Amino acid sequence: RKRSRKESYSIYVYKVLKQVHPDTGISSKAMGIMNSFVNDIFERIAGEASRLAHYNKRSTITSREIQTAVRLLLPGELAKHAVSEGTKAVTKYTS
Amino acid sequence: KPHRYRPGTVALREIRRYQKSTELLIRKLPFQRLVREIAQDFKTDLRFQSSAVMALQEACEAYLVGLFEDTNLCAIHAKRVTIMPKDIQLARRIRGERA
C-alpha cells in the first residue's frame, strides 16, 4: 500500500532560484538547508505575532501584527525591504 | 603630618560597601534625560511612565555590573589589577556582542 506524502518548500525555492540566477542549479543538501531556513523564519515571525496579539487582547492576527513582528525580528535594511515587499504584495492582492 | 591611607585600602572598603547595598548608583535626572533624548530620536513627542524609566535604569545597571565582573576576570587573566578598554572589548567579543 501507499506511503504517506510529506510537504516541503522545494519547488518554490527552485522557482525563486531560477528567477534570480537563471542558469544555476542547487544540490540536495542545500535544499534541505533552505527548507530548514524557511521553516525557522516562519515559526519565529508567527510566534512573535501571536505574542504581540496576546499582549493587546486581540483574537485575530492581521497584516499589522505580521508587519510589527517583522520590524522586531529582522535587522535594519532587511526590515525596511521586507516591510516594503509585504506591503506591496498585500496592496496588489487587495486591489 | 595628617593621616593617609595607602593606595588600595579605600578601594577595597568601597568594594565591600557597594557590594553590601542595593541602591541605584546612577543619578535619576541625568539618566531620565538621556533616555528621553534617545527615544526622541526614535519618535517625536513621546511620554514615559515613571515605572518605565525606573525599569530601564535597573536593567542598565545590572548589565553594566555584569560586564564589569567579566572585565575584571579578563584583567586578572592578563596578570594585571587595572582594567583597560581591551578587557571590555575581549569580554564583549567572547560574550557575543561584537561577534
Binding site: V16, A30, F37, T60, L78, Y93 | -
Partner: protein, 109 residues
C-alpha cells in the same frame, strides 16, 4: 487587483499563500487569522529566500561551479553583515568555517 485564480498568483508571488494560511490557522497561534496575513508572510519569506539564494549563487560562481552546495550558503551568510546577525546562533551542516588567521601568528621579518 481582482482575480479568480490561485491567491499566490493574484498577490504576485511564487510561494503558496493557501498553504501558509493553513499553517497559520492550524498551528495554535491565535483564534482567528485575517485575510491579509498569509499574503504578507509569503512575501516576506520570498524576499528573504531570494536574498540568500542570490548571495549563494554569487559565491558558487566565484568558484567556477554550476551548482550550490552548503559551503556556498555558509560563505554567503557569514560574509553578509545582516544575514550573519539574523542567523548568528545557527549551524549549517557541512558548511565549514570562514578563513581567518590572527595577525599575531603570521611570520615576521
Amino acid at each position: 487587483s481582482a482575480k479568480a485564480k490561485t491567491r499566490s498568483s493574484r498577490a504576485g508571488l511564487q510561494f503558496p499563500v493557501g498553504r501558509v494560511h493553513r499553517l497559520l490557522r492550524k498551528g495554535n497561534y491565535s483564534e482567528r487569522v485575517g485575510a491579509g496575513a498569509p499574503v504578507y508572510l509569503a512575501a516576506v519569506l520570498e524576499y528573504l529566500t531570494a536574498e540568500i539564494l542570490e548571495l549563494a549563487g554569487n559565491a558558487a560562481r566565484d568558484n567556477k561551479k554550476t551548482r550550490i552546495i552548503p559551503r556556498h550558503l555558509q560563505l554567503a551568510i557569514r560574509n553578509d553583515e545582516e544575514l550573519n546577525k539574523l542567523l548568528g546562533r545557527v549551524t549549517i551542516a557541512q558548511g565549514g568555517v570562514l578563513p581567518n588567521i590572527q595577525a599575531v601568528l603570521l611570520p615576521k621579518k
